[PDB]
Amino acid sequence: MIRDIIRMGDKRLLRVAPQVTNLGSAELHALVSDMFETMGAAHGVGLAAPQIAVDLQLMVFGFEASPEAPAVPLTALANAQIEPLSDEMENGWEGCLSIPGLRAVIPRYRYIRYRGFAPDGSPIEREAEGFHARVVQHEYDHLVGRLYPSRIENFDTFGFDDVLSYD
Ligand code: NA
Helix, strand or coil, rough: CCCCCCCCCCCHHCCCCCCCCCCCCCHHHHHHHHHHHHHHCCCCCCHHHHHHHCCCCCEEECCCCCCEEECCEEEEEEEEEECCCCCCEEEEEEECCCCEEEEEEEECCEEEEEEECCCCCCEEEEEEHHHHHHHHHHHHHHHHCHHHHHHHCCCCEEEEECCCCCC
16 A cells, blocks of 8 residues: 655654564564565655654665666565674765655765664664665664754755756
């Protein structure tokens, strides 16, 4: 079932989510399925459970075709933990389905490792770089009640997607 995506300004996006504790369950499988369906209908590349008002450490992401590549594998990741693999930052465009019509340039770590669990309870640990790593950092911030405007450094880059002409 496609779920409503709540928009920036909803206080539910500002919560620190608790962990998923029903790995392998039918309930978590149904939630994940709704999340992939919801992310697909909105044409997202990532979606975090709090954006559908579900207070849990859970995200989905990935795609073949969306600008970007090597396309990230479709992944559902519970209880994600991230760490940078270098201090190197890279700027790149981010927009949010909870922030429709907008985007800004945001610095993110270029290289990370993320760990958590697939919805069947098997562990996931991967190194990622570039767009893949950016997506995961963006969704991870949702799970700690943080949205991308609070990461903007150059406000000349922030505006509506159909009007920005920043290089
Ligand atoms: Na908060």
